[PDB]
Scaffold this active site. Structure first.
Site, PDB file in Angstrom:
ATOM      1  N   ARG B   9      37.294  30.924  37.866  1.00 63.86           N
ATOM      2  CA  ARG B   9      37.580  30.858  36.438  1.00 63.86           C
ATOM      3  C   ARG B   9      38.435  29.653  36.073  1.00 63.86           C
ATOM      4  O   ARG B   9      38.312  29.124  34.964  1.00 63.86           O
ATOM      5  CB  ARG B   9      38.270  32.143  35.984  1.00 63.86           C
ATOM      6  CG  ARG B   9      37.521  33.412  36.354  1.00 63.86           C
ATOM      7  CD  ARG B   9      36.144  33.464  35.718  1.00 63.86           C
ATOM      8  NE  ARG B   9      35.446  34.705  36.035  1.00 63.86           N
ATOM      9  CZ  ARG B   9      34.661  34.883  37.088  1.00 63.86           C
ATOM     10  NH1 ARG B   9      34.442  33.913  37.961  1.00 63.86           N
ATOM     11  NH2 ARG B   9      34.080  36.064  37.272  1.00 63.86           N
ATOM     12  N   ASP B 450      41.629  51.550  32.321  1.00 64.03           N
ATOM     13  CA  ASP B 450      40.657  50.517  32.655  1.00 64.03           C
ATOM     14  C   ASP B 450      39.710  51.025  33.735  1.00 64.03           C
ATOM     15  O   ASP B 450      40.156  51.593  34.736  1.00 64.03           O
ATOM     16  CB  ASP B 450      41.358  49.242  33.120  1.00 64.03           C
ATOM     17  CG  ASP B 450      40.407  48.075  33.247  1.00 64.03           C
ATOM     18  OD1 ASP B 450      39.219  48.241  32.910  1.00 64.03           O
ATOM     19  OD2 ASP B 450      40.845  46.991  33.681  1.00 64.03           O
ATOM     20  N   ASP B 452      37.249  49.093  35.362  1.00 68.43           N
ATOM     21  CA  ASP B 452      36.738  48.088  36.277  1.00 68.43           C
ATOM     22  C   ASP B 452      37.458  48.171  37.621  1.00 68.43           C
ATOM     23  O   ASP B 452      38.491  48.829  37.766  1.00 68.43           O
ATOM     24  CB  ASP B 452      36.890  46.693  35.673  1.00 68.43           C
ATOM     25  CG  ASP B 452      36.063  45.650  36.394  1.00 68.43           C
ATOM     26  OD1 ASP B 452      35.335  46.016  37.340  1.00 68.43           O
ATOM     27  OD2 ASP B 452      36.136  44.462  36.015  1.00 68.43           O
ATOM     28  N   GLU B 455      38.194  42.538  41.935  1.00 66.76           N
ATOM     29  CA  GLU B 455      37.321  41.618  42.648  1.00 66.76           C
ATOM     30  C   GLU B 455      38.142  40.453  43.185  1.00 66.76           C
ATOM     31  O   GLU B 455      39.323  40.296  42.867  1.00 66.76           O
ATOM     32  CB  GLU B 455      36.197  41.107  41.741  1.00 66.76           C
ATOM     33  CG  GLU B 455      35.302  42.205  41.193  1.00 66.76           C
ATOM     34  CD  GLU B 455      34.225  41.675  40.269  1.00 66.76           C
ATOM     35  OE1 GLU B 455      34.155  40.443  40.079  1.00 66.76           O
ATOM     36  OE2 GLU B 455      33.447  42.491  39.731  1.00 66.76           O
ATOM     37  N   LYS B 474      41.772  49.107  38.788  1.00 68.47           N
ATOM     38  CA  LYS B 474      42.853  48.246  38.319  1.00 68.47           C
ATOM     39  C   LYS B 474      44.051  49.054  37.835  1.00 68.47           C
ATOM     40  O   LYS B 474      45.200  48.687  38.103  1.00 68.47           O
ATOM     41  CB  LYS B 474      42.347  47.336  37.202  1.00 68.47           C
ATOM     42  CG  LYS B 474      41.424  46.235  37.673  1.00 68.47           C
ATOM     43  CD  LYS B 474      41.054  45.304  36.535  1.00 68.47           C
ATOM     44  CE  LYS B 474      40.241  44.127  37.028  1.00 68.47           C
ATOM     45  NZ  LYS B 474      39.860  43.215  35.921  1.00 68.47           N
ATOM     46  N   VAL B 500      37.257  52.936  27.036  1.00 67.29           N
ATOM     47  CA  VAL B 500      37.629  53.275  25.666  1.00 67.29           C
ATOM     48  C   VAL B 500      36.428  52.993  24.772  1.00 67.29           C
ATOM     49  O   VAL B 500      36.093  51.835  24.511  1.00 67.29           O
ATOM     50  CB  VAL B 500      38.862  52.491  25.207  1.00 67.29           C
ATOM     51  CG1 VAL B 500      39.210  52.834  23.769  1.00 67.29           C
ATOM     52  CG2 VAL B 500      40.035  52.788  26.118  1.00 67.29           C
ATOM     53  N   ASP B 524      38.434  41.891  26.500  1.00 67.93           N
ATOM     54  CA  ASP B 524      37.750  40.605  26.514  1.00 67.93           C
ATOM     55  C   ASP B 524      36.436  40.625  25.740  1.00 67.93           C
ATOM     56  O   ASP B 524      35.680  39.650  25.812  1.00 67.93           O
ATOM     57  CB  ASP B 524      37.485  40.157  27.954  1.00 67.93           C
ATOM     58  CG  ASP B 524      36.541  41.089  28.686  1.00 67.93           C
ATOM     59  OD1 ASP B 524      36.462  42.273  28.301  1.00 67.93           O
ATOM     60  OD2 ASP B 524      35.881  40.641  29.648  1.00 67.93           O
ATOM     61  N   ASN B 525      36.141  41.700  25.011  1.00 68.75           N
ATOM     62  CA  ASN B 525      34.922  41.801  24.223  1.00 68.75           C
ATOM     63  C   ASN B 525      35.261  42.273  22.819  1.00 68.75           C
ATOM     64  O   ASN B 525      36.273  42.944  22.600  1.00 68.75           O
ATOM     65  CB  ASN B 525      33.909  42.757  24.864  1.00 68.75           C
ATOM     66  CG  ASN B 525      34.443  44.164  25.006  1.00 68.75           C
ATOM     67  OD1 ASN B 525      34.009  45.076  24.306  1.00 68.75           O
ATOM     68  ND2 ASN B 525      35.385  44.350  25.920  1.00 68.75           N
ATOM     69  N   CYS B 580      11.233  29.089  19.212  1.00 68.19           N
ATOM     70  CA  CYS B 580      10.300  27.983  19.406  1.00 68.19           C
ATOM     71  C   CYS B 580      10.906  26.880  20.263  1.00 68.19           C
ATOM     72  O   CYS B 580      10.173  26.161  20.949  1.00 68.19           O
ATOM     73  CB  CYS B 580       9.851  27.424  18.055  1.00 68.19           C
ATOM     74  SG  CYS B 580      11.106  27.447  16.734  1.00 68.19           S
TER      75      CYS B 580
HETATM   76  N1  LIG Z   1      35.919  48.998  26.433  1.00 68.04           N
HETATM   77  C1  LIG Z   1      36.814  48.824  27.410  1.00 68.04           C
HETATM   78  N2  LIG Z   1      37.617  49.858  27.738  1.00 68.04           N
HETATM   79  C2  LIG Z   1      38.513  49.692  28.713  1.00 68.04           C
HETATM   80  N3  LIG Z   1      38.753  48.607  29.452  1.00 68.04           N
HETATM   81  C3  LIG Z   1      37.946  47.599  29.106  1.00 68.04           C
HETATM   82  C4  LIG Z   1      36.972  47.619  28.121  1.00 68.04           C
HETATM   83  N4  LIG Z   1      36.331  46.392  28.040  1.00 68.04           N
HETATM   84  C5  LIG Z   1      36.923  45.672  28.962  1.00 68.04           C
HETATM   85  N5  LIG Z   1      37.911  46.336  29.642  1.00 68.04           N
HETATM   86  C6  LIG Z   1      38.741  45.820  30.723  1.00 68.04           C
HETATM   87  O1  LIG Z   1      39.507  44.767  30.195  1.00 68.04           O
HETATM   88  C7  LIG Z   1      39.880  43.879  31.273  1.00 68.04           C
HETATM   89  C8  LIG Z   1      39.572  42.479  30.815  1.00 68.04           C
HETATM   90  O2  LIG Z   1      40.197  41.557  31.732  1.00 68.04           O
HETATM   91  P1  LIG Z   1      39.441  40.273  32.254  1.00 68.04           P
HETATM   92  O3  LIG Z   1      38.329  39.902  31.277  1.00 68.04           O
HETATM   93  O4  LIG Z   1      40.401  39.185  32.530  1.00 68.04           O
HETATM   94  O5  LIG Z   1      38.740  40.779  33.584  1.00 68.04           O
HETATM   95  P2  LIG Z   1      37.266  40.795  34.186  1.00 68.04           P
HETATM   96  O6  LIG Z   1      36.296  40.917  33.009  1.00 68.04           O
HETATM   97  O7  LIG Z   1      37.112  41.802  35.253  1.00 68.04           O
HETATM   98  O8  LIG Z   1      37.133  39.322  34.748  1.00 68.04           O
HETATM   99  P3  LIG Z   1      36.268  38.006  34.516  1.00 68.04           P
HETATM  100  O9  LIG Z   1      36.137  37.900  32.997  1.00 68.04           O
HETATM  101  O10 LIG Z   1      37.157  36.869  35.019  1.00 68.04           O
HETATM  102  O11 LIG Z   1      34.964  38.105  35.229  1.00 68.04           O
HETATM  103  C9  LIG Z   1      38.982  44.271  32.449  1.00 68.04           C
HETATM  104  O12 LIG Z   1      39.744  45.158  33.255  1.00 68.04           O
HETATM  105  C10 LIG Z   1      37.908  45.137  31.793  1.00 68.04           C
HETATM  106  O13 LIG Z   1      37.604  46.165  32.724  1.00 68.04           O
HETATM  107 MG   LIG Z   2      36.232  39.453  31.532  1.00 64.05          MG
HETATM  108 MG   LIG Z   3      35.686  42.548  36.492  1.00 60.46          MG
END
Ligand SMILES: Nc1ncnc2c1ncn2[C@@H]1O[C@H](COP(=O)(O)OP(=O)(O)OP(=O)(O)O)[C@@H](O)[C@H]1O
Ligand SMILES: [Mg+2]
Ligand SMILES: [Mg+2]
EC number: 6.2.1.45
Lengths: 147, 985
Positions: B9, B450, B452, B455, B474, B500, B524-525, B580
């Protein structure tokens, strides 16, 4: 989201498009089945074309997904029903209504744009042999858009 | 030999050359308090050659106010010795050492020197040697809510990249003889006066294609000028211009020279008269410390404040500063001289670490030179701050009590927060909360959620996780780490593993959200951010949003009934190319990468899904025939992947890969050139293959070429994985099999009743019955970018490069292909630290319950140019409803679970409004245009029963409320917005 969708729906209801009619599927506001009437000055005259409109969860901040359902023989429409319109891919702004989209599609049907086509073979037929394109379009709009 | 599996990254922000030059630079850090340890942590995670520490003073209890590598068992031991052991475990490629004594000549062993917690005379002594020997010198200081940064990189610093942006490139429509270069339609170059550009592929003006950069004179958003091109030609048509970035020379000044006449950097333009005050104030602080055996003024002490003000007057007179000293601000600096906050420490540590990276890599524009920052708006006003309350209690929170007092400390200790996500920002937030003593009281509690797993690539910016923790959740690891940091948080933290979203409302329900105090997002979304924002708006809880992108960052605060929500603000979304452009006429490598991704999905994922669904659903064919857009395509895919082309060995997979190469890179191009020959013209007479459209050329399969072999290997491996066969990588078998392949002939076709259903039925019945094949499943290929042993990015890179070779586009390597295809967001540790610091500075504002809107500050910053800005939050819009003031966002209607008719009557009699649309979730419960039969059937039902009937799903036991969106018209029919309805079941 729902508020903007219903505002557009009410605007369509109060103001008759007269060439289109968009309505929700069942009782779902994120899925519409619109209808388009073939332009008079086009090979697709006397035809009814059905479109599926899926509003994204981020509407109106993202463009709606509009896909043809009735098969149509148009240079800018492929077999999957995808429509080549600039206002649906990257030029979308949160200021365009569904009536504007339907008017744009009707204008596209009125005169295709073969210089930047989506179906190269139909574009070639249109550019070289106009009569064959006219006959094929009439045959397709009679076979699919009627009945 | 950069370990791309760890710096994945970061390399998207810095680059390979920057990190190669950074892995040969030594950094010395003087002072190992909270700021020093933060700088050391950020530098160690960055990846410098080595880090050296120097702080021989014995550890004290108050030092634990911002140090997270010190424990109460370490009292009396030098800080460097007890900190190096824990710093050495952050990164395995960065050795960390300790030096007992510092000698001037020793400074020549290092590339950068950071100085903290040092007297001014010693700083001058060090700088007088590190200036004339060309050594980068960064001095940082943190006093309470004030911070100072000073940078000196020598008198001949060379800055290769001044903004960190990619070079601007664009297409040209026409070039006149007067040097007027014009872009295409609705195309903005974005250049600025003084830039240098070079032209290529210009038809009619070969001279501009030499490559020598030329000046740019901006004449408009769509055109610019380069000078005179009379000799080269008359008029030029088409071509591509690309910006050239030239190195710049930046000259600094020594500390001794810059003390008299500094050059400030303003972090905020609303208070431009302050930095001159701080310049005198910090020197007076150093003088006072020198005059009292290194003892800073006591907290909130009047006599020490008066003495400090006298020193300020003396220094201002000595330096001939023609500025009137502000007594209140200077005395405020005096009061908080012994303060030590973790938020300010994190902010300054991130900033100084970024400056160190700039100094080592000779990249980005640095601070020039002084940077004075204050967050005085965070000082509590609802508690009694005095000398008695701010005196130390002999506890680890002395550094914070000295600024906020004991009462505010008790207020913090009883917080009940909710942190969403446990990424880098989540880890930093948890560290700050542990240091601040959040939820260490009897009524406190912390929740972290969380789903995830850890990694390898997450360890670069998430310092709470170690390589031994790869593969675990995490939240649990973060909770354990922060319980280790602060033992008082044992049992006060709850870690969930739930995403969430709409499906987690059974756990994060009304009971859970009614006991919180604030919600902090580390996501991050955008979807999850919007969902959390909606939940906070419904429950009326303060929200803290923070986002990062490379070196840029922003922080926003949402306060109930005061400021607008997160969803009321819009950010530029991603740009999706026209269909296109991707399908037929690409002109950039991104188009080819997107096409390759779509091809991968269509070859290895969708057909397998169709095959698997066919063998599971007993009525799949009938549903697809009248539901799917292309039933014929689905039938063809099922037939091909079941009977027609089912491999029995790896050799057949290789043959299929060769056939697909021919299909996608040699035949479709021939068809396209048959429909649109290279000499074809448009309707206006212009050549068709000109400008954005590039004439393609079919590829002939050459096994000796690297790209063709790579595509064959990747496709064969993925096909074998789909069919569960044994793949091989030895080139011998590939060369043996592909020699005996006979290409089927292909000639482009010019073309020239209701039996289609009969043909589809004939195709369908050819498929074996589902009962014949029981337990036979094909493995779909789920795209995973981070794994390098599944041939996903390899296949995408091969396909993209081959399509680029088709259209004479510049091919891209695997690194950029992984960056583009995988939607990887660049991230940095310094940006994370800065955003965490800003959010934790807003948190103390939220805790104090400040009411005015000018006391909150949404923050934005860009570390590439050293830009920081803070603005007031946008107030929530008001409106007039029934002649009353209604808040658009934070107001709602509270109603019982009455019938729909009673709800309409209530809105008609109380608000004098006619209901026209009523919805809930994704359903349209009631509308004014529905047939009267449906309404008469639905009117006498309650809202809960109506929702159950419409959504065809019973309300869950945990559900206790409904959110209804209502649009209503007034008596005259004019539409008026109204707040949503909160039906109480
Ligand atoms: N809807 C959600 N509910 C709970 N946790 C979430 C949700 N969306 C994302 N997360 C968590 O938010 C954190 C975002 O951190 P970050 O984007 O830095 O990590 P990552 O996505 O694992 O890494 P990378 O983007 O470098 O591949 C991650 O732990 C992701 O699991
Ligand atoms: Mg991310
Ligand atoms: Mg991840």
């Amino acid at each position: 989201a729902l508020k903007r969708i219903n505002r557009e729906l009410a605007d369509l209801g109060k103001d008759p498009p007269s060439s289109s009619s968009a309505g929700p599927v069942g009782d779902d506001l994120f899925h519409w089945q619109a209808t388009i009437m073939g332009p008079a000055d086009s090979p697709y005259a006397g035809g009814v074309f059905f479109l599926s409109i899926h509003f994204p969860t981020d509407y109106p901040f993202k463009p709606p997904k509009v896909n043809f359902t009735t098969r149509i023989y148009h240079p800018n429409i492929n077999s999957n029903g995808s429509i080549c319109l600039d206002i649906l891919r990257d030029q979308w702004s949160p200021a365009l209504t569904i009536s504007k989209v339907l008017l744009s599609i009707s204008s596209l049907l009125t005169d295709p744009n073969p210089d930047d086509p989506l179906v190269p073979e139909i574009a070639h037929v249109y550019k070289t042999d106009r009569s064959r394109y006219e006959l094929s379009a009439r045959e397709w709009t009679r076979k699919y858009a009627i009945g | 030999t950069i370990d791309e599996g760890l710096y994945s990254r970061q390399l998207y922000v810095l680059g390979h050359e920057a990190m190669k030059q950074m892995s040969q630079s030594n950094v010395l850090i003087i002072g190992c308090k909270g700021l020093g340890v933060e700088i050391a942590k950020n530098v160690c995670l960055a990846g410098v050659k080595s880090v050296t520490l120097y702080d021989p003073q014995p550890t004290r209890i108050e030092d634990l106010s911002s140090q997270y590598f010190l424990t109460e068992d370490d009292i009396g031991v030098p800080r460097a010795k007890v900190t190096v052991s824990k710093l050495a475990e952050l990164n395995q490629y960065v050795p960390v050492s300790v030096v007992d004594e510092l000698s001037t000549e020793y400074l020549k062993n290092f590339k950068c020197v950071v100085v903290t917690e040092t007297s001014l005379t010693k700083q001058l002594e060090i700088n007088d040697f590190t200036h004339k020997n060309h050594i980068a010198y960064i001095a940082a200081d943190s006093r309470g809510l004030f911070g100072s940064i000073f940078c000196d990189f020598g008198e001949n610093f060379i800055c290769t990249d001044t903004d960190g942006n990619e070079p601007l490139t664009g297409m040209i429509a026409s070039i006149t003889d007067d040097g007027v270069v014009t872009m295409l339609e609705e195309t903005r170059h974005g250049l600025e006066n003084g830039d240098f550009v070079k032209f290529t592929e210009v038809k009619g003006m070969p001279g501009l294609n030499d490559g020598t950069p030329r000046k740019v004179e901006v004449k408009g958003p769509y055109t610019f000028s380069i000078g005179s091109v009379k000799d080269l030609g008359s008029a030029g048509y088409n071509g591509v211009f690309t910006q050239v970035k030239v190195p710049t020379k930046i000259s600094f000044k020594s500390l001794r020279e810059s003390l008299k006449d500094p050059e400030y950097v303003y972090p905020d333009f609303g208070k431009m008269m302050r930095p001159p005050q701080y310049h005198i104030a910090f020197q007076a602080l150093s003088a006072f410390a020198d005059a009292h055996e290194g003892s800073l003024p006591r907290p909130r002490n009047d006599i020490d404040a008066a003495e400090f003000f006298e020193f300020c007057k003396k220094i201002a007179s000595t330096l001939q500063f023609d500025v009137e000293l502000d007594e209140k601000l200077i005395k405020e600096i005096s009061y908080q001289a012994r303060g030590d906050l973790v938020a300010m420490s994190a902010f300054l540590g991130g900033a100084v670490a970024q400056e160190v990276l700039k100094a080592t890599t000779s990249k980005f524009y640095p601070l020039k030179q002084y940077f004075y920052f204050d967050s005085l708006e965070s000082l509590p006003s609802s508690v009694t701050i005095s000398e008695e309350t701010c005196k130390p209690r002999g506890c680890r929170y002395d550094g914070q009590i000295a600024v906020f007092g004991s009462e505010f400390q008790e207020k913090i200790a009883s917080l009940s927060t909710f942190l969403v996500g446990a990424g880098a920002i989540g880890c930093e937030m948890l560290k700050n909360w542990a240091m601040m003593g959040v939820a260490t009281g009897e009524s406190g509690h912390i929740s972290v959620t969380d789903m995830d797993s850890i990694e390898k690539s997450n360890l670069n910016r998430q310092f709470l996780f170690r390589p031994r923790d790869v593969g675990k959740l995490k939240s649990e690891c973060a909770s354990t780490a922060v319980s280790i940091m602060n033992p008082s948080l044992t049992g006060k933290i709850t870690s969930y593993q739930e995403r969430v979203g709409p499906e987690s409302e059974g756990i994060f329900g009304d009971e859970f959200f009614e006991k919180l105090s604030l919600v902090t997002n580390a996501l991050d979304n955008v979807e999850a951010r919007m969902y959390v924002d909606r939940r906070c708006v419904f429950f009326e809880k303060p929200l803290l949003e923070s986002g990062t992108l490379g070196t840029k960052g922003n922080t926003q605060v949402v306060v109930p009934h005061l400021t607008e929500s997160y969803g009321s603000s819009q950010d530029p979304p991603e740009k999706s190319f026209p269909i296109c452009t991707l399908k037929n006429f690409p002109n950039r490598i991104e188009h080819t990468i997107a096409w390759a991704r779509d091809l991968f999905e269509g070859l290895f994922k969708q057909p397998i899904d169709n095959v698997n669904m066919y063998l599971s659903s007993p009525n799949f064919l009938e549903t697809s025939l009248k539901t799917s857009s292309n039933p014929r395509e689905v039938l063809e895919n099922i037939r091909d992947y079941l009977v027609t082309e089912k491999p029995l060995s790896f050799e057949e997979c290789i043959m299929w890969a060769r056939l697909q190469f021919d299909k996608f890179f040699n035949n479709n191009i021939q068809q396209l050139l048959f429909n649109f020959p290279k000499d074809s013209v448009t309707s206006t007479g212009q050549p068709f293959w000109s400008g954005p459209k590039r004439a393609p050329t079919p590829l002939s399969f050459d096994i000796h070429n690297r790209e063709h072999f790579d595509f064959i290997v990747a496709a064969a491996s993925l096909y074998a994985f789909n069919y569960g066969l044994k793949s091989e990588t030895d080139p011998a078998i590939y060369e043996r099999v592909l020699a005996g392949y006979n290409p089927p002939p292909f000639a482009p076709k010019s073309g020239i009743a209701n039996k289609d259903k009969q043909e589809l039925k004939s195709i369908a019945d050819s498929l074996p019955p589902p009962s014949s094949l029981v337990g036979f499943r094909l493995t779909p290929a789920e795209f995973e970018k981070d794994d390098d042993s599944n041939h996903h990015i390899d296949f995408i890179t091969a396909a993209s490069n081959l399509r680029a070779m088709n259209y004479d586009i510049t091919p891209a390597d695997r690194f950029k292909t992984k960056f583009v295809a995988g939607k990887i967001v660049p991230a940095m540790c310094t940006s994370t630290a800065v955003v965490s610091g800003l959010v934790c500075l807003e948190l103390v504002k939220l805790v104090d319950g400040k009411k005015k809107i000018e006391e909150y500050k949404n923050g934005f910053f860009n570390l590439a140019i050293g830009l920081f800005t803070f603005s007031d939050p946008i107030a929530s819009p008001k409106m007039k409803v029934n002649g009353k003031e209604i808040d658009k966002i934070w107001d709602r209607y509270n109603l019982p679970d009455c019938t729909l008719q009673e709800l309409i009557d209530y809105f008609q009699k109380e608000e004098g409004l006619e209901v026209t649309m009523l919805s809930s979730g994704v359903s349209l419960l009631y509308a004014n245009f529905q047939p009267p039969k449906k309404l008469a059937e639905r009117l006498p039902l309650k809202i809960s029963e109506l929702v159950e009937q419409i959504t065809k799903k019973k309300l869950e036991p945990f559900r206790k409320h409904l959110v209804l969106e209502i649009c209503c018209d007034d008596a005259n029919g004019e539409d008026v917005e109204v707040p949503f309805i909160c039906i109480k079941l």
